[PDB]
C-alpha cells in the first residue's frame with residue numbers, strides 16, 4: 001500500500017510497469033559498490049526508481065580532480081570517503097528511499113553482509129572480487145550485477161540464477177516465463193575449442209575480449225589504464241592483449257592495436273548509457289517484470305552499438 | 314582529455330538546450346561533466362510532483378518553480394563554474410529569432426510535441442546550426458542529427474498524425490470512450506477556457522447523418538452544477554432524441570436526472586466509481602474551477618492542464634457521465650487521465666541513456682566528424698542481430714521535403730466556397746504546416762494580402778470565404794513565416810466532393 005505522495009511521484013512509471021511491479025521495487029534493498037562515475041548514475045537511477053533502500057559502499061577516498069566530475073560529490077570534498085561524500089545529494093533525489101553508506105572494503109565483508117540485500121551491483125572491482133561476490137550471491141539467492149566503463153566502451157553483466165518473471169504480450173494477458181543465467185566464473189572462462197563455440201565466436205563482439213584484457217590489466221595493476229600514463233599503459237595493454245587472446249587460441253589481431261586509444265578514463269556520456277542500461281536491468285529483475293538481458297551487455301560509444309551476448313553456457 | 318582541438322570548442326562554444334524535462338536534466342548534467350561551459354536552457358513550464366521520478370535536478374521543494382531556473386541552480390551546485398543562461402519561456406516566442414539561434418554551435422532538442430520540434434527544426438535550418446533531435450517513450454528512445462544541406466531534416470519524413478474526430482459524432486453520436494473524453498475536454502474549454510466553434514458541446518443540429526426539419530448561460534447561472542448537469546445530461550440528451558433518424562440501429566442515449574442519480578484492487582484512481590459518485594465529482598470540480606476562474610479576474614480564461622486535480626476531475630466525471638448515458642462502461646480516473654492528457658509513460662533510465670548518446674553525437678559534430686554521426690534506436694529487446702542499440706546511417710536531404718527543399722511547394726485540395734480565411738490561417742497554415750506567425754498573400758496582380766502577422770490587420774477577412782478574394786482552382790498562394798524564415802508556395806485545387814467532415818487535404822499525404 002503506497003502513500004498518496006508516492007502515487008503522485010511514480011505516476012509516469014506506474015503507467016509503464018504497473019503498481020505491483022512498483023511495490024516489489026518498494027520492498028527491495030540494493031547494494032552498490034564503487035561510487036565513481038558509473039556507480040553515481042546507477043545510484044541516481046535506482047533512488048529515483050524508488051527502491052526500498054540503497055547502500056552505497058566504497059572504501060576509497062575522493063582524490064584530487066574528482067569532485068567536479070561526480071555530480072553527487074560537492075567540489076569541496078577532496079579527501080573524504082566517496083560514499084559519504086555522495087550520501088547527501090543521493091538521499092535528496094528521493095526522500096522515500098533509505099540510502100545508507102558503508103566505508104569498508106568489499107573484499108572483507110562476510111556472507112551475512114550480503115544477505116540483507118535483494119540485489120548486488122558491483123563497480124570498479126577486480127575479477128577475483130566479481131567472481132567472489134557472484135558466488136556468494138548465488139548461494140543466497142541474491143541477484144548479481146556488475147558493470148564498468150572504459151573510455152568509449154562499457155559493459156554490464158547479470159546472474160539472476162533461476163529467474164522467473166511476468167511478460168505482457170497479447171485486454172492484455174500477462175504470461176509467466178523463466179530464464180536461467182550462469183555463473184560469472186563460467187561467463188568469464190569460455191572454451192573456444194568446442195565446435196559449437198567456434199561457430200559462435202564469429203558472431204561474438206570483440207568487446208568481450210576487450211573486457212578480458214582490461215580485467216587482466218586491473219589485476220596485474222590495482223588500477224585501470226590512466227591518461228597520465230597513457231604511453232605506458234597502452235604498451236602494457238597491447239602486451240596483455242597478445243597474452244590473453246593467445247591463451248584462448250584466438251588470433252591477437254582480433255583486437256586492433258588501435259583499441260588502446262578508445263578505452264581510457266571514464267566519460268560522462270558513457271557512464272550515463274551503461275548506468276541507464278544496468279539500472280534498468282536491476283529494476284526489471286527486482287520487479288520480476290519483462291525479460292532480462294542474458295547475460296552480457298556491451299556498449300561501444302564510437303560506433304553506437306549496444307549488443308547483448310549470452311556467454312558461459 | 315578529449316583531446317585538445319575538441320576540448321577547445323567544447324570549452325568556448327555556446328550550446329543550446331530546448332526543454333528541461335527527462336532528457337533535458339540528464340543532458341545538462343552530461344554536457345557540464347563532459348566539459349561544456351556555455352549553455353543556454355529554455356523551458357516554458359514549472360516543476361510538478363510527477364516530474365520527480367526522472368528529472369533529477371528537481372526536488373519536492375522546487376514544485377511550482379521554473380524548470381529552467383531550478384535546473385540552472387542545481388547544476389551550479391556540483392559545477393559552480395558553469396556559465397548557464399536560463400529562460401522560463403516558450404521557444405516559439407518571437408524573441409528567439411534566427412539571429413538568436415545562429416549564436417550556437419550546437420542545438421539539442423528535448424521536447425515533447427510536434428509543433429515546437431518543427432519550429433526548432435526550421436530555426437536551425439535557417440541559422441544553419443547542427444541540431445540533435447531526440448525522443449523517449451517508456452523503454453524506447455532515438456537520437457539523430459540534423460544538418461542543413463547534409464542530412465534529412467525533422468520534417469523530411471513527417472510522423473503519422475493522431476486520430477482526429479468529426480465534430481458530428483462527438484456532439485450527436487459517440488461510440489467509443491475516447492469520444493466522451495474528447496467531449497468532456499471540449500466542454501471544459503467552452504465553460505472555463507477558450508471558445509472554439511469546432512469544440513461546441515451542444516448537439517449539432519447540422520449533422521447530415523440525420524435529417525432535421527453555452528459559455529453565456531453557464532456564467533449567468535453562476536456555474537450551478539445542478540443547472541449545468543440537467544442541461545448536459547438530461548435536456549440535451551433528450552433534445553438529441555428529437556432527431557429520430559439518429560437511432561434505429563443502435564441503443565439510444567438515456568437521460569439522467571440530478572435528483573434521481575443522487576437517490577440511488579490497486580490505486581484509488583484505478584477504481585471505477587458508480588454514476589452517483591461521478592455526478593458528485595462533477596459538481597465538486599465545478600465549484601473549485603469557478604472559484605479559480607473568478608480569482609483570475611473578469612474576461613479571464615482557464616487553460617486545461619492534465620496535472621491539475623480539478624481540471625482532471627471535471628473531464629473524468631463529465632466523460633464518465635456521458636459514457637454511461639450511451640450504454641458504455643465507464644473508466645477509472647487513472648485511465649481517463651492517460652487518454653485525456655495523452656500521457657507517455659516515463660522512467661529515469663531511458664532518458665539517461667538517450668542524453669548520454671546525445672552528447673556522444675555532439676562531440677563528433679563539434680569534432681568535424683558529422684559523417685560518423687548516426688541515428689540510434691534504443692529498443693526494449695535485442696534484435697535478431699543481438700542489437701539493443703541500433704545505429705543507422707544518416708540520410709541525405711529529401712528533395713520532396715516541403716520544408717527544407719530549395720523551393721517548398723505543396724498542393725492543397727479544398728472547397729474555395731466553404732473555407733474561410735480563418736480556417737486557412739489556423740487549421741492549414743498554422744496547424745497543418747506548423748507556421749507560428751504567417752503572412753499569406755495571393756499570387757496575383759496587386760498581390761492580395763489574405764493574412765498578416767501584424768495583430769489587427771486582416772481581422773476583417775477572417776470570416777470571408779476564399780473565393781471572395783478570387784481564389785479558385787489553379788490559384789497559387791505564398792505563405793511566409795518570417796520568424797522561421799520559411800516560405801511555402803501553396804497550390805489550390807478546388808473540390809466540392811472532398812468527403813464527410815473533410816475541410817481540406819494535402820495532395821500526396823497518406
Ligand SMILES: Nc1ncnc2c1ncn2[C@@H]1O[C@H](COP(=O)(O)OP(=O)(O)OP(=O)(O)O)[C@@H](O)[C@H]1O
Pocket residue numbers: 012331332333334335336355356357358363364380402403404405423424425426429656657
Ligand atoms: N515550446 C516549448 N518551449 C520550451 N519548452 C517546451 C516547449 N514545449 C515543451 N517544452 C518542455 O519540454 C519538456 C519535455 O519534457 P518531458 O516530456 O520529458 O517531461 P514533461 O513534459 O514534464 O512530462 P509530462 O508531460 O508527462 O508531464 C517539458 O519540460 C516542457 O515544459
Ligand SMILES: [Mg+2]
Pocket residue numbers: 425
Ligand atoms: Mg509534457
Ligand SMILES: [Zn+2]
Pocket residue numbers: 465466467468469470711714715716717718
Ligand atoms: Zn526536410
